[PDB]
């Protein structure tokens, strides 16, 4: 059994590794196929245990990864793509 | 430690606290388990001073 | 630094990953209650399969028990043990 | 390791591999990067065999 305080601590609003679809970050790139199609990003997650609050990023960074891009039936390449990350999170109105 | 979690549960059981107070106490406790008993008293004081 | 392709591939591939889940979403029938905390950390299938004919599904599942504060507003609150569904194994499989 | 990642990139860019061979090779490489070179030669020999 997981103890109450241990739950509360691990669940409270903070940056957590979150798997995100690349198309969600780059919606105009629908013509392409990406490998991988999703990437691990530090994003604000968890609860504020309030109803007047919400977990939101107070500090952001950008991270660069090597992704394979395929335009079906005209070549593929592995290049660098940038993704927004959350460094600090807070419960806010 | 079972004792630290027992104190956490006690503070959380006080009904008259609001969302903000609740969290302050629990998070302070989580950050510093040594202050567990003192944080319990202060919340007790607060809980009854906030009696409806 | 730049995340290498082989590391992105490995880390994004279908597997059990800690995911924060609304308790209300797992206990749809108890939204009279208010929970503290309102969400819990649960191992769940996530990631990609990089094959349009495959999907990431759980192939092994277990339950985990947590101490949650169950608050009946203005008429009580008490610590209760609550069970949640967890994903132990995730595989890419045909849809 | 820059070496292992380079091998992974070379295999990934092979045009005639299918999604399954793709993954199998990359995943074997991750599992035992000391097999990177052999995995690439195997993948290259395969890619050329599966040419139109």
UniProtKB/Swiss-Prot annotation, chain C:
Induction: By hypoxia. Regulated by growth factors, cytokines, gonadotropins, nitric oxide, hypoglycemia and oncogenic mutations. Disulfide bonds join 14-56, 45-90, 49-92. Higher expression in pituitary tumors than the pituitary gland. Glycans are attached at residue 63. It is linked to Microvascular complications of diabetes 1: Pathological conditions that develop in numerous tissues and organs as a consequence of diabetes mellitus. They include diabetic retinopathy, diabetic nephropathy leading to end-stage renal disease, and diabetic neuropathy. Diabetic retinopathy remains the major cause of new-onset blindness among diabetic adults. It is characterized by vascular permeability and increased tissue ischemia and angiogenesis. Belongs to the PDGF/VEGF growth factor family. This is Vascular endothelial growth factor A, long form. The gene is VEGFA. The chain holds residues 219 to 313 of 395 of the full protein.
């Amino acid at each position: 059994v997981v103890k109450f305080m241990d739950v509360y601590q691990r669940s409270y609003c903070h940056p957590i590794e979150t798997l995100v679809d690349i198309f969600q970050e780059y919606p105009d790139e629908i013509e392409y196929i990406f490998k991988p199609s999703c990437v691990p990003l530090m994003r604000c997650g968890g609860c504020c245990n309030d109803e007047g609050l919400e977990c939101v990023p107070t500090e952001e960074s950008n991270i660069t990864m090597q992704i394979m891009r395929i335009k079906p039936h005209q070549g593929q390449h592995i290049g660098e793509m940038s993704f927004l990350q959350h460094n600090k999170c807070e419960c806010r109105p | 430690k079972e004792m630290h979690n027992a104190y956490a549960i006690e503070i959380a059981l006080l009904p008259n606290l609001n969302d903000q107070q609740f969290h302050a106490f629990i998070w302070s406790l989580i950050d510093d388990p040594s202050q567990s008993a003192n944080l319990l008293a202060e919340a007790k004081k607060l809980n009854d001073a906030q009696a409806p």
